[PDB]
Amino acid sequence: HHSSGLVPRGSHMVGLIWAQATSGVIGRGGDIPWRLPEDQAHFREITMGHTIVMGRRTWDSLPAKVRPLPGRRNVVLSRQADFMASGAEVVGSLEEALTSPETWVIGGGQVYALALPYATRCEVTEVDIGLPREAGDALAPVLDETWRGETGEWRFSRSGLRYRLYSYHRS
Numbered sequence: 001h002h003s004s005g006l007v008p009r010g011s012h013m014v015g016l017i018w019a020q021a022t023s024g025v026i027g028r029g030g031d032i033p034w035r036l037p038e039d040q041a042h043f044r045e046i047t048m049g050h051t052i053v054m055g056r057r058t059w060d061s062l063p064a065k066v067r068p069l070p071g072r073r074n075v076v077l078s079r080q081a082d083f084m085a086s087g088a089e090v091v092g093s094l095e096e097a098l099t100s101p102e103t104w105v106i107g108g109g110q111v112y113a114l115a116l117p118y119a120t121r122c123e124v125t126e127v128d129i130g131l132p133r134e135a136g137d138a139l140a141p142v143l144d145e146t147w148r149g150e151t152g153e154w155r156f157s158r159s160g161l162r163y164r165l166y167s168y169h170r171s
C-alpha cells in the first residue's frame with residue numbers, strides 16, 4: 001500500500017538518516033571514519049527545518065563549537081538525569097522525543113535500533129570504503145522485508161570515494 005510524501009501536521013512522521021560503509025559500520029571510537037561533502041550536503045538538505053533526534057553519544061561526537069546543529073530543533077536522548085546539552089533538549093525516551101510532525105533520527109547505532117519500529121522512512125548513504133566491522137563499532141540497522149527500497153547508482157565523491165544513496169519507505 002502507498003504512502004504520501006506530504007506530512008499532515010497532526011501526524012508523527014519518523015525517519016532515520018545515516019551514512020554507512022559497505023560493511024554496515026557507521027561509527028568507531030566516537031567518530032565517523034569518513035567525511036564526504038556530498039553526504040554532508042545531503043544530510044542538511046533532508047533534515048533542515050525539522051526536528052533532529054540523536055543519542056547522547058552522537059551529541060558528544062559533535063564538536064562543541066558546532067552544536068546544537070543550526071536550523072533544526074536538537075533533541076538528545078539520555079538516561080542520565082544529570083546529562084545536559086547546552087542549546088538543546090535532553091529527554092529520557094523516544095516517546096518524549098517524537099512530538100514534532102516530522103522528526104529525523106540522526107544517530108547513532110543504539111538510537112537507530114530503538115527508533116526503527118516507529119520509522120516509515122530511511123535515507124542512507126553508502127560509502128564504498130573497505131572498513132571491516134570491529135568489536136565496539138556502531139552499526140547501521142538492517143531493514144526487513146516490510147521496507148521497500150530505491151537504490152541509486154554508484155557515484156563518485158570529490159573526496160575520491162564511491163558512494164550511493166538509498167531511500168526506503170514503509171507504511
Ligand SMILES: NC(=O)c1ccc[n+]([C@@H]2O[C@H](COP(=O)([O-])OP(=O)(O)OC[C@H]3O[C@@H](n4cnc5c(N)ncnc54)[C@H](OP(=O)(O)O)[C@@H]3O)[C@@H](O)[C@H]2O)c1
Binds near residue numbers: 055092112
Ligand atoms: N554514520 C552516521 O550516519 C552516524 C550518525 C550519527 C552518529 N554516528 C556515530 O555513531 C557512534 C555513536 O553511536 P552509539 O550507538 O555508540 O550511541 P548513540 O546511539 O548515538 O547514543 C547512545 C546513548 O543514547 C542514550 N540512549 C540509548 N537508548 C536510550 C533510551 N531507550 N532512552 C533514552 N536514552 C537512550 C544513552 O545515553 P546515556 O548513556 O547518557 O544514558 C546511550 O548511551 C559514534 O561513533 C558516532 O560518531 C554515525
Ligand SMILES: CCc1nc(N)nc(N)c1OCCCOc1ccccc1C[C@H](C(=O)O)C(F)F
Binds near residue numbers: 061
Ligand atoms: C554528516 C554525517 C551524517 N551523514 C548522514 N547521511 N546521516 C547522518 N546521520 C550523519 O550524521 C549526522 C550527525 C553527525 O554529524 C557530525 C559528526 C561529527 C562531526 C561533525 C558532524 C556534523 C556534520 C559534519 O559537518 O560532518 C554535519 F554535516 F551534520
